[PDB]
Amino acid sequence: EPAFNYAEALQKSMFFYEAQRSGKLPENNRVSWRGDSGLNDGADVGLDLTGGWYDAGDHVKFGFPMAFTATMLAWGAIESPEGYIRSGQMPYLKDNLRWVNDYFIKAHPSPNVLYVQVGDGDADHKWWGPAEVMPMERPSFKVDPSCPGSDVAAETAAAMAASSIVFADDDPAYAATLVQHAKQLYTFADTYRGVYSDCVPAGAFYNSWSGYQDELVWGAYWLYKATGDDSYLAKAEYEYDFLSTEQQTDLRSYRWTIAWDDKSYGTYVLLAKETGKQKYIDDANRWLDYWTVGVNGQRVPYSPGGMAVLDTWGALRYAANTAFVALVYAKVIDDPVRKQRYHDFAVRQINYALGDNPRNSSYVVGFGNNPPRNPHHRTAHGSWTDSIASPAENRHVLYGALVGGPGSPNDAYTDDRQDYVANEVATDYNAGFSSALAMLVEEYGGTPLADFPPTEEPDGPEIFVEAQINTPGTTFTEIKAMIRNQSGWPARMLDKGTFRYWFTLDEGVDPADITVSSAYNQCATPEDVHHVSGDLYYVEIDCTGEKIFPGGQSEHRREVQFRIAGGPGWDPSNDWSFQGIGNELAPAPYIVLYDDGVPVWGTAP
Ligand SMILES: [Ca+2]
Ligand SMILES: [Ca+2]
């Protein structure tokens, strides 16, 4: 039966994409530790560019890999709708695709204008904290006739074209809108030629190494499938002859694999599947042979554990991408030997990622045996001090994320959040992987978990007040209060906070004689005290205007030292807020914190 529960893995992969969402989240949000974020995206250009997915463990919205991710997910859903239907994940796949496509629509204000990036890679990567409280500015970047991007435009066109097929039967109106956008985007890409990275500051992250030739063949094919317009298939087969050859021969590239950059490999198979021409079959075969048996003595590096290691970065992502295409190809080819070779290779690579390896551990967060616990992801970590080192363990479980894994062919791996190689996570990492899982569910089955996602509970008070006696006295009480915002369910801002300290007026003390002073207060220092009833009074500290958020050592807290002097007769033992306050800084349950007038911590008299 299933060696691993492929349905559960796919179920968790869909949750991962939901955790990567940007913009205003829906009522039905399943990720309780995620809230609204990136709400002012596009503001700098007068457009609403909210929505879409955060690329990896950061908060930049990189259009090139985001679009590729969409095309791959749609492809898997087209190949194996049954896998998604049986795992009960089809509605989640559609919800994820609609989320990203709704953004592509927003990002395409007019036929030849495509916004391909929101956020600056360097400014974004300098800060380590939750998406909900990002403090930096997020610029919008685009490509147009003046500075084109055939690669990213053609990819987005393919993503929308491929997605339309998925929605065709459900929402024919939406499917039509997607196809219309895809057509315009492809014309733009075909007419105004250029590499997008020459126009937007994405070179250091997602540089178009292969160029755009591969995206022109890839986009044309998908448009053919979405429209049925023969001209597109003609266009694909024409552009195909200009694909990159390798080193010294006329053999088309067969030593790498399909990913966000080079789609050559996918077209080999897609066209072979579509036309049946020996031309495509020869290329597809050479490539898949290099990954399995080798061609001319050369073969992709293999670990003793049986993992295909193509490169240091996203090793598992690469193996997973190849595994998916191998499964698609294995169905079209007639040769029984090649069919078995490719199919078995695919299953072996996915199984390795799910736990069938020398470490006996899953490489999918929150899944299987001994999974990674500390993926390199800002929001999942939940740091409130702008530090990748604290807290030690991630505060949230990023269910479903496939990590980079072993970067070398030695099966070695250490679950370290600071290791951006082994523990990196990203939308494209789960694309081919998910599609492969859909195929495997259809073939081997598996059952999804009835109660998923689990509801996480906070690791402590999120927003609270700590206090301690600063200086002992008899005619006064001097408190050292600390307001803390270490929220993570979800991380939130506290910019309208005030707190009250209640006390009981004592015999012989005139309230007109009570003074509240401070030698250090990050908030306001009040002149009066407030009378409730009888001899119950309170001092109110006003911190409104102060942005207290989990985004740094100074940002997450406000220190407030305050002395309430009442003169002889002052007696704190009958003061409500005084209960439990000692000489060590600790949570003060009787000091109440208000967020715009609404109690958030402590209990009042
Ligand atoms: Ca390319
Ligand atoms: Ca008193």
Side-chain angles (χ1 to χ4, degrees), residues 55 65 149 234 275 437 570 580-581 603:
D55 184 62
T275 70
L437 292 174
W570 182 256
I581 297 178
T603 67

mmCIF file of all heavy atoms in Angstrom, residues 55 65 149 234 275 437 570 580-581 603:
data_model
loop_
_atom_site.group_PDB
_atom_site.id
_atom_site.type_symbol
_atom_site.label_atom_id
_atom_site.label_comp_id
_atom_site.label_asym_id
_atom_site.label_seq_id
_atom_site.Cartn_x
_atom_site.Cartn_y
_atom_site.Cartn_z
ATOM 1 N N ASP A 55 7.660 34.988 -1.360
ATOM 2 C CA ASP A 55 8.497 33.989 -2.000
ATOM 3 C C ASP A 55 8.988 32.812 -1.157
ATOM 4 O O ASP A 55 8.676 31.660 -1.451
ATOM 5 C CB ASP A 55 9.692 34.654 -2.686
ATOM 6 C CG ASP A 55 10.538 33.662 -3.443
ATOM 7 O OD1 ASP A 55 10.015 33.037 -4.390
ATOM 8 O OD2 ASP A 55 11.720 33.488 -3.079
ATOM 9 N N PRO A 65 9.429 33.585 -9.976
ATOM 10 C CA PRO A 65 9.159 32.279 -9.367
ATOM 11 C C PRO A 65 7.702 32.096 -8.926
ATOM 12 O O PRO A 65 7.193 30.974 -8.914
ATOM 13 C CB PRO A 65 10.127 32.261 -8.180
ATOM 14 C CG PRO A 65 10.211 33.692 -7.793
ATOM 15 C CD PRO A 65 10.340 34.372 -9.137
ATOM 16 N N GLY A 149 10.225 42.397 -20.340
ATOM 17 C CA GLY A 149 10.569 41.203 -19.593
ATOM 18 C C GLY A 149 9.806 40.049 -20.199
ATOM 19 O O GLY A 149 8.782 39.641 -19.665
ATOM 20 N N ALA A 234 1.760 25.981 -33.240
ATOM 21 C CA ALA A 234 2.673 26.255 -34.344
ATOM 22 C C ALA A 234 3.810 27.133 -33.827
ATOM 23 O O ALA A 234 4.985 26.870 -34.094
ATOM 24 C CB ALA A 234 1.934 26.960 -35.472
ATOM 25 N N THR A 275 2.479 16.111 -29.686
ATOM 26 C CA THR A 275 2.662 15.750 -31.090
ATOM 27 C C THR A 275 3.091 14.312 -31.348
ATOM 28 O O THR A 275 2.668 13.704 -32.326
ATOM 29 C CB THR A 275 3.688 16.675 -31.763
ATOM 30 O OG1 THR A 275 4.994 16.399 -31.242
ATOM 31 C CG2 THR A 275 3.342 18.137 -31.496
ATOM 32 N N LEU A 437 3.049 14.530 -5.820
ATOM 33 C CA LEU A 437 2.191 13.929 -4.807
ATOM 34 C C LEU A 437 0.791 13.629 -5.342
ATOM 35 O O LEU A 437 0.221 12.588 -5.031
ATOM 36 C CB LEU A 437 2.101 14.827 -3.574
ATOM 37 C CG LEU A 437 3.377 14.974 -2.744
ATOM 38 C CD1 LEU A 437 3.148 16.008 -1.667
ATOM 39 C CD2 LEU A 437 3.778 13.636 -2.137
ATOM 40 N N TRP A 570 0.831 56.774 53.535
ATOM 41 C CA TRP A 570 0.790 55.966 52.327
ATOM 42 C C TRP A 570 0.969 54.509 52.736
ATOM 43 O O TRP A 570 1.899 54.170 53.468
ATOM 44 C CB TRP A 570 1.897 56.405 51.369
ATOM 45 C CG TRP A 570 1.897 55.666 50.067
ATOM 46 C CD1 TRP A 570 2.751 54.670 49.693
ATOM 47 C CD2 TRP A 570 0.997 55.860 48.965
ATOM 48 N NE1 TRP A 570 2.437 54.230 48.430
ATOM 49 C CE2 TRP A 570 1.366 54.937 47.960
ATOM 50 C CE3 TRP A 570 -0.087 56.719 48.736
ATOM 51 C CZ2 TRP A 570 0.693 54.855 46.736
ATOM 52 C CZ3 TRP A 570 -0.754 56.636 47.518
ATOM 53 C CH2 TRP A 570 -0.363 55.704 46.536
ATOM 54 N N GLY A 580 1.316 41.002 44.459
ATOM 55 C CA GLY A 580 2.264 40.193 43.718
ATOM 56 C C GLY A 580 3.501 40.856 43.149
ATOM 57 O O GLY A 580 4.362 40.157 42.615
ATOM 58 N N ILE A 581 3.615 42.177 43.263
ATOM 59 C CA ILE A 581 4.782 42.879 42.732
ATOM 60 C C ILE A 581 5.946 42.718 43.694
ATOM 61 O O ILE A 581 5.834 43.049 44.872
ATOM 62 C CB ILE A 581 4.493 44.381 42.499
ATOM 63 C CG1 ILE A 581 3.393 44.551 41.449
ATOM 64 C CG2 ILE A 581 5.747 45.090 42.032
ATOM 65 C CD1 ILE A 581 3.009 45.992 41.192
ATOM 66 N N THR A 603 -6.391 41.898 35.329
ATOM 67 C CA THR A 603 -7.768 41.931 35.813
ATOM 68 C C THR A 603 -7.989 43.166 36.686
ATOM 69 O O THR A 603 -7.158 43.495 37.535
ATOM 70 C CB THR A 603 -8.137 40.635 36.583
ATOM 71 O OG1 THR A 603 -7.391 40.555 37.798
ATOM 72 C CG2 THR A 603 -7.790 39.420 35.755
#
